[PDB]
Amino acid sequence: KRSRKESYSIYVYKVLKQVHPDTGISSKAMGIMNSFVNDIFERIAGEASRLAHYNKRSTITSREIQTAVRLLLPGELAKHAVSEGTKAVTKYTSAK
DNA sequence: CGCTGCGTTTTTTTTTTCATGTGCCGGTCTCACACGTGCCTGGAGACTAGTAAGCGCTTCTAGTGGCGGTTAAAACGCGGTAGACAGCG
Ligand SMILES: [K+]
């Protein structure tokens, strides 16, 4: 009956196994991938949070995220993150 | 006395060994990844409801030219000096 500390480690595995199905990952290295996601979570949730505050909006939409992601991410990483982002919202709304 | 070159003795530079740490192969042991199982909480469903936000229309600002005039500011160039870069101890 211990606290119950969540993480992202099961999703990192899931994606590790998609991209390098034969490869694995040490505790320390997952620990890093965990920090990484929370870090770029907070970074985006913030810039979005601002964008909204700055334009007197109460709702963080996908539009805010896309701006956050343009702002926070470099040239080529940005173009793709937007795309997989765009792609995922589009796939979700059609799906159901 | 002064020089001059030429065999000597040393110095510089080359060639070959040589002792060193490299990263390279293949067998043992450890504890960490991965699985799994079972329980529990947090996401999903769905429907309710109340309000944010987006679009059009109303106004009027504050942004974009554009027009000459004068002046302060750039341009350019020449002339020399001190500071950058190498070389010696
Ligand atoms: K205006």
Write the CB contacts of A25 (distance below 8 Å, at least 6 apart in sequence). A12, A13, A16, A33
The 10 Å Cβ neighbour count of residue A49 is: 14
Q: Verify if strand B has an atom below 7 Å from the CB of A24.
A: yes
Which amino acid, residue A1?
Answer: K
Closest residue by Cα to residue A48 from A80, A70, A33: A70
Strand B near-CB residues (< 7 Å), A 69-88: none
Closest residue by Cα to residue A63 from A45, A78, A75, A48: A48
Packing angle between helix A62-72 and helix A27-54, nearest 10 degrees?
110
For residue A45, give both structure tokens.
């949730």
Q: Verify if strand B has an atom below 7 Å from the CB of A25.
A: yes
Expressed in Å, this structure's resolution amounts to 2.9
